[PDB]
Amino acid sequence: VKNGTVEEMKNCSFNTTTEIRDKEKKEYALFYKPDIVPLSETNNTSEYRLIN
Amino acid sequence: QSALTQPASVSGSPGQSITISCTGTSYDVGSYNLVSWYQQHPGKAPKLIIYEVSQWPSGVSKRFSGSKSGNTASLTISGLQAEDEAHYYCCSYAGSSTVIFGGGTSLTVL
Amino acid sequence: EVQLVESGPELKEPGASVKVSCKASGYTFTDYYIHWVRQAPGQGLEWMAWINPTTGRSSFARGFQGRVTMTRETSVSTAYMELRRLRSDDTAVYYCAKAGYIALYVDYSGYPNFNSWGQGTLVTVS
Amino acid sequence: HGIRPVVSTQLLLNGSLAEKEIVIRSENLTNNAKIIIVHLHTPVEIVCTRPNNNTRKSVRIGPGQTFYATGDIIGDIKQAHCNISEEKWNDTLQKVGIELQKHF
Amino acid sequence: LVLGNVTENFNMWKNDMVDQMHEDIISLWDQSLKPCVKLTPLCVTLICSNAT
Ligand SMILES: *[C@@H]1O[C@H](CO)[C@@H](O[C@@H]2O[C@H](CO)[C@@H](O[C@@H]3O[C@H](CO[C@H]4O[C@H](CO[C@H]5O[C@H](CO)[C@@H](O)[C@H](O)[C@@H]5O[C@H]5O[C@H](CO)[C@@H](O)[C@H](O)[C@@H]5O)[C@@H](O)[C@H](O[C@H]5O[C@H](CO)[C@@H](O)[C@H](O)[C@@H]5O[C@H]5O[C@H](CO)[C@@H](O)[C@H](O)[C@@H]5O)[C@@H]4O)[C@@H](O)[C@H](O[C@H]4O[C@H](CO)[C@@H](O)[C@H](O)[C@@H]4O[C@H]4O[C@H](CO)[C@@H](O)[C@H](O)[C@@H]4O[C@H]4O[C@H](CO)[C@@H](O)[C@H](O)[C@@H]4O)[C@@H]3O)[C@H](O)[C@H]2NC(C)=O)[C@H](O)[C@H]1NC(C)=O
Ligand SMILES: *[C@@H]1O[C@H](CO)[C@@H](O[C@@H]2O[C@H](CO)[C@@H](O[C@@H]3O[C@H](CO[C@H]4O[C@H](CO)[C@@H](O)[C@H](O)[C@@H]4O)[C@@H](O)[C@H](O[C@H]4O[C@H](CO)[C@@H](O)[C@H](O)[C@@H]4O[C@H]4O[C@H](CO)[C@@H](O)[C@H](O)[C@@H]4O)[C@@H]3O)[C@H](O)[C@H]2NC(C)=O)[C@H](O)[C@H]1NC(C)=O
Ligand SMILES: *[C@@H]1O[C@H](CO)[C@@H](O[C@@H]2O[C@H](CO)[C@@H](O[C@@H]3O[C@H](CO[C@H]4O[C@H](CO)[C@@H](O)[C@H](O)[C@@H]4O)[C@@H](O)[C@H](O[C@H]4O[C@H](CO)[C@@H](O)[C@H](O)[C@@H]4O)[C@@H]3O)[C@H](O)[C@H]2NC(C)=O)[C@H](O)[C@H]1NC(C)=O
């Protein structure tokens, strides 16, 4: 929102190994920015990773 | 109406002193002190009184001092002048960043 | 100096979207929450919602959780709100008013004191 | 007597007090690479807060064991910050100045 | 070893030896299962029987 005129936190969603091994489910959470890193070998911003 | 409760109507002669009550629950008003009141003559937008439990917004004089205790709040309409006949409303901060209004009331015509 | 202005009253069919508008004057539009409230004709008040005019984030009453839409216009000194899925019961007067200062370090979204009103506008449902 | 095991980098929070005056310590002040500790007699009061009303969420991972993550923020977000009184900090920093001048 | 002239109190329900063996058995038994398979590959979608 408004190119950083905000105290931002980023939202992200991900696939988890649910209680059944091979029937994974989608989930959503939010993280503070220092714990997310860009993934793509290109400039693409769509996909992200934990800093670990 | 919503959980915030207020008496339907209160009456009294000129020169009296009246307390308009406002009741909530431990969740909303029994835990936070952001209580405010509003005055409204019919056919117009209301006007604020008591912007924060007891402090005074403008030149409205001491005739409307507020108070709170537990889940209860009060508006002390005092030194009654019959021209103050109008609707009076309670409202306070609540859970989940929401705001709720009291049921409103009607002042004396006597 | 300060004066809040709204669109004119409207008439609508059930299930419609009501584009109530609120334009500001006499104060820095970016420094105060603009705060919405409802009043059925001859009845009490009902809170609607918040909008940070600088950030656009909002939250609103659970009673309208079905669908409500918000907008802030920084360059216009004006804000919009939209009640949608309109019932016959939702006929009422609608106001906007100037709530507490947007502190850079304290969550003032919530302080119910607002000391300047718009003139009011209603929607009829038929 | 009980020490406080608190982790902190630049300012030693919740610490004890020097009994008389500000004191300074180094293995040798000539080596600039050495850490120089400063200890204060007068406690500067620091208050911090994170007024975003963060909310807890409970995702679950595989068999049984949960994993927690932040849900939707209720409210309008605001910066996390720390506050220190200006006059206290100015006076205390100037006093540390004189204590450094005792060696310089 | 019989004792000629003794006189001793016996409170039973506050006898600590039960706790000193409850924790003993819990620690011992929970240590006996360590080297064996921790199942985990069985939380799987079981698709199964015909009519009873
Ligand atoms: C950490 O640290 C940090 C730091 O860094 C922190 O933070 C912080 O915090 C704090 C606390 O919380 C906060 O505070 C806040 O603030 C805000 C703001 O401030 C500012 O501003 C304001 C306003 O201004 C305006 O007005 C004026 C007058 O007043 C004028 O003059 C000017 O000019 C302006 O104007 C406007 O308009 C124009 C047009 O043109 C434009 O241009 C502009 O821009 C604007 O818009 C002000 O006011 C202030 O001042 C004040 O204060 C001071 C100090 O105290 C003093 O000295 C002064 O005098 C003043 O006073 C006051 O008070 C009295 C009583 O006492 C009254 O009467 C008056 O009036 C005043 O008010 C500054 O400058 C503010 O606002 C706030 O306050 C508010 O709110 C609260 C809540 O509720 C309450 O309580 C209070 O009381 C108040 O209230 C009021 O207001 C509201 C709104 O705002 C309303 O609603 C109510 O009702 C009331 O009303 C009143 O008033 C009004 C006016 O004002 C009138 O009209 C009526 O009638 C009535 O009277 C608070 O204070 C801060 O902010 C922060 N920071 C930041 C950066 O953000 C933290 O906290 C820490 N941490 C921890 C944990 O602690
Ligand atoms: C952080 O980011 C995540 C995503 O990255 C986000 O969570 C996801 O948000 C989206 C968008 O809000 C959610 O999508 C919802 O989709 C449902 C449709 O569900 C379908 O799938 C289920 C499961 O099989 C079926 O059972 C179902 O029948 C559907 O086929 C929508 O219903 C949701 O929208 C409702 O709310 C809108 C207002 O926000 C309305 O405009 C809209 O019309 C929907 O309301 C209607 O349906 C209601 C019943 O659902 C009804 O009661 C109303 O009256 C109305 O008619 C929504 O689009 C997605 O589910 C989220 N993810 C998960 C896992 O739930 C987070 O929100 C985000 N967080 C932050 C803080 O940014
Ligand atoms: C900061 O963020 C936290 C976490 O998000 C918020 O915590 C909530 O605070 C609100 C306000 O105190 C609470 O609101 C109440 O929630 C009830 C939900 O009930 C469930 O939870 C309780 C508590 O465990 C159980 O006892 C119950 O059985 C349920 O499991 C609602 O029922 C309440 O609404 C009812 O009462 C009001 C009057 O009070 C009526 O007007 C309503 O119409 C309705 O009938 C009430 O809304 C909430 O429980 C808290 N949740 C948690 C997880 O702590 C903080 O509120 C937030 N800070 C601010 C300022 O909002």
Tab-separated table of N, CA and C in Angstrom, chain B residues 4 22-37 51-54 67-73 90-100, chain C residues 107 109-112, chain D residues 51-54 74:
chain	number	residue	atom	x	y	z
B	4	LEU	N	-24.593	-2.732	24.795
B	4	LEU	CA	-24.492	-1.507	25.584
B	4	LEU	C	-25.890	-0.963	25.852
B	22	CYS	N	-25.234	4.147	31.924
B	22	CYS	CA	-24.786	3.375	30.776
B	22	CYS	C	-24.053	2.143	31.281
B	23	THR	N	-24.512	0.971	30.842
B	23	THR	CA	-24.043	-0.311	31.351
B	23	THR	C	-23.511	-1.147	30.198
B	24	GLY	N	-22.446	-1.898	30.464
B	24	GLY	CA	-21.842	-2.774	29.477
B	24	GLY	C	-21.535	-4.142	30.047
B	25	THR	N	-20.276	-4.556	29.954
B	25	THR	CA	-19.831	-5.843	30.472
B	25	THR	C	-18.342	-5.711	30.769
B	26	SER	N	-17.801	-6.685	31.506
B	26	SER	CA	-16.374	-6.684	31.815
B	26	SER	C	-15.511	-6.674	30.559
B	27	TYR	N	-16.029	-7.197	29.445
B	27	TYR	CA	-15.234	-7.258	28.225
B	27	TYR	C	-14.906	-5.876	27.682
B	28	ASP	N	-15.880	-4.958	27.661
B	28	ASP	CA	-15.768	-3.761	26.840
B	28	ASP	C	-15.541	-2.554	27.737
B	29	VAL	N	-16.456	-2.250	28.661
B	29	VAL	CA	-16.368	-1.003	29.419
B	29	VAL	C	-15.742	-1.246	30.782
B	30	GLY	N	-15.830	-2.475	31.292
B	30	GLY	CA	-15.189	-2.818	32.548
B	30	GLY	C	-13.689	-3.005	32.458
B	31	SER	N	-13.117	-2.952	31.250
B	31	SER	CA	-11.686	-3.114	31.041
B	31	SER	C	-11.024	-1.918	30.376
B	32	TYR	N	-11.789	-1.040	29.725
B	32	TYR	CA	-11.255	0.124	29.031
B	32	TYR	C	-12.044	1.355	29.437
B	33	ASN	N	-11.376	2.507	29.418
B	33	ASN	CA	-11.924	3.748	29.954
B	33	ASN	C	-12.280	4.745	28.861
B	34	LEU	N	-12.472	4.279	27.628
B	34	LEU	CA	-12.832	5.149	26.510
B	34	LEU	C	-14.352	5.180	26.360
B	35	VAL	N	-14.969	6.038	27.167
B	35	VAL	CA	-16.412	6.245	27.175
B	35	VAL	C	-16.678	7.678	26.742
B	36	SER	N	-17.657	7.850	25.858
B	36	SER	CA	-18.033	9.171	25.383
B	36	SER	C	-19.542	9.222	25.238
B	37	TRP	N	-20.064	10.444	25.229
B	37	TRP	CA	-21.493	10.700	25.183
B	37	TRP	C	-21.794	11.687	24.064
B	51	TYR	N	-15.340	13.692	25.642
B	51	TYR	CA	-14.563	12.949	24.659
B	51	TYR	C	-13.760	11.820	25.282
B	52	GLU	N	-13.548	11.847	26.594
B	52	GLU	CA	-12.822	10.771	27.252
B	52	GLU	C	-13.230	10.693	28.715
B	53	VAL	N	-14.146	9.779	29.034
B	53	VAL	CA	-14.690	9.507	30.371
B	53	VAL	C	-15.077	10.749	31.182
B	54	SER	N	-14.166	11.714	31.369
B	54	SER	CA	-14.454	12.912	32.161
B	54	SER	C	-14.013	14.223	31.528
B	67	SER	N	-18.848	9.867	34.867
B	67	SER	CA	-18.239	8.985	35.849
B	67	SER	C	-18.374	7.551	35.367
B	68	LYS	N	-17.536	6.682	35.926
B	68	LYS	CA	-17.512	5.278	35.551
B	68	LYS	C	-17.191	4.457	36.791
B	69	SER	N	-17.688	3.224	36.812
B	69	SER	CA	-17.335	2.278	37.866
B	69	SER	C	-17.683	0.882	37.384
B	70	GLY	N	-16.674	0.030	37.240
B	70	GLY	CA	-16.916	-1.315	36.747
B	70	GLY	C	-17.493	-1.285	35.349
B	71	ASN	N	-18.601	-1.997	35.160
B	71	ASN	CA	-19.280	-2.051	33.871
B	71	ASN	C	-20.285	-0.924	33.683
B	72	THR	N	-20.269	0.094	34.544
B	72	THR	CA	-21.279	1.143	34.558
B	72	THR	C	-20.638	2.494	34.279
B	73	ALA	N	-21.389	3.359	33.599
B	73	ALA	CA	-20.977	4.728	33.334
B	73	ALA	C	-22.193	5.630	33.474
B	90	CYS	N	-24.952	7.009	24.901
B	90	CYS	CA	-23.692	6.468	25.383
B	90	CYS	C	-22.973	5.750	24.251
B	91	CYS	N	-21.652	5.668	24.366
B	91	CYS	CA	-20.859	4.885	23.430
B	91	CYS	C	-19.489	4.668	24.049
B	92	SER	N	-18.858	3.558	23.674
B	92	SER	CA	-17.563	3.230	24.244
B	92	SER	C	-16.815	2.286	23.320
B	93	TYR	N	-15.500	2.252	23.509
B	93	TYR	CA	-14.657	1.320	22.781
B	93	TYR	C	-14.978	-0.103	23.215
B	94	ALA	N	-14.808	-1.043	22.289
B	94	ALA	CA	-15.166	-2.434	22.537
B	94	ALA	C	-14.103	-3.356	21.962
B	95	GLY	N	-14.416	-4.641	21.850
B	95	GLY	CA	-13.462	-5.597	21.340
B	95	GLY	C	-13.305	-5.531	19.835
B	96	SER	N	-12.202	-6.120	19.377
B	96	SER	CA	-11.938	-6.301	17.955
B	96	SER	C	-11.906	-4.968	17.212
B	97	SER	N	-11.389	-3.939	17.873
B	97	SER	CA	-11.295	-2.592	17.319
B	97	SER	C	-12.644	-2.044	16.888
B	98	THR	N	-13.726	-2.473	17.530
B	98	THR	CA	-15.061	-2.003	17.207
B	98	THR	C	-15.521	-0.959	18.219
B	99	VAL	N	-16.560	-0.223	17.836
B	99	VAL	CA	-17.205	0.760	18.694
B	99	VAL	C	-18.693	0.453	18.703
B	100	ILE	N	-19.323	0.637	19.862
B	100	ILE	CA	-20.728	0.303	20.059
B	100	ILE	C	-21.408	1.489	20.725
C	107	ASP	N	-2.038	3.226	18.643
C	107	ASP	CA	-3.197	2.725	17.906
C	107	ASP	C	-4.440	3.526	18.290
C	109	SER	N	-6.836	4.113	16.356
C	109	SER	CA	-8.029	3.541	15.751
C	109	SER	C	-8.811	2.818	16.829
C	110	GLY	N	-9.877	3.442	17.302
C	110	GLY	CA	-10.673	2.870	18.366
C	110	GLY	C	-11.221	3.916	19.306
C	111	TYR	N	-10.612	5.090	19.338
C	111	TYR	CA	-11.038	6.068	20.315
C	111	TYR	C	-12.359	6.643	19.821
C	112	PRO	N	-13.478	6.471	20.527
C	112	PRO	CA	-14.772	6.767	19.909
C	112	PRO	C	-15.103	8.241	19.827
D	51	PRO	N	2.592	-1.884	19.650
D	51	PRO	CA	1.145	-1.741	19.820
D	51	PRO	C	0.297	-2.358	18.719
D	52	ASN	N	0.882	-2.978	17.697
D	52	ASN	CA	0.087	-3.818	16.814
D	52	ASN	C	-0.518	-4.942	17.630
D	53	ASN	N	-1.841	-5.027	17.642
D	53	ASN	CA	-2.497	-6.087	18.401
D	53	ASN	C	-2.410	-7.408	17.643
D	54	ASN	N	-1.196	-7.947	17.621
D	54	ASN	CA	-0.931	-9.211	16.955
D	54	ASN	C	-1.763	-10.323	17.579
D	74	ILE	N	-5.682	-7.414	14.255
D	74	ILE	CA	-6.817	-6.581	14.620
D	74	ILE	C	-6.316	-5.180	14.931
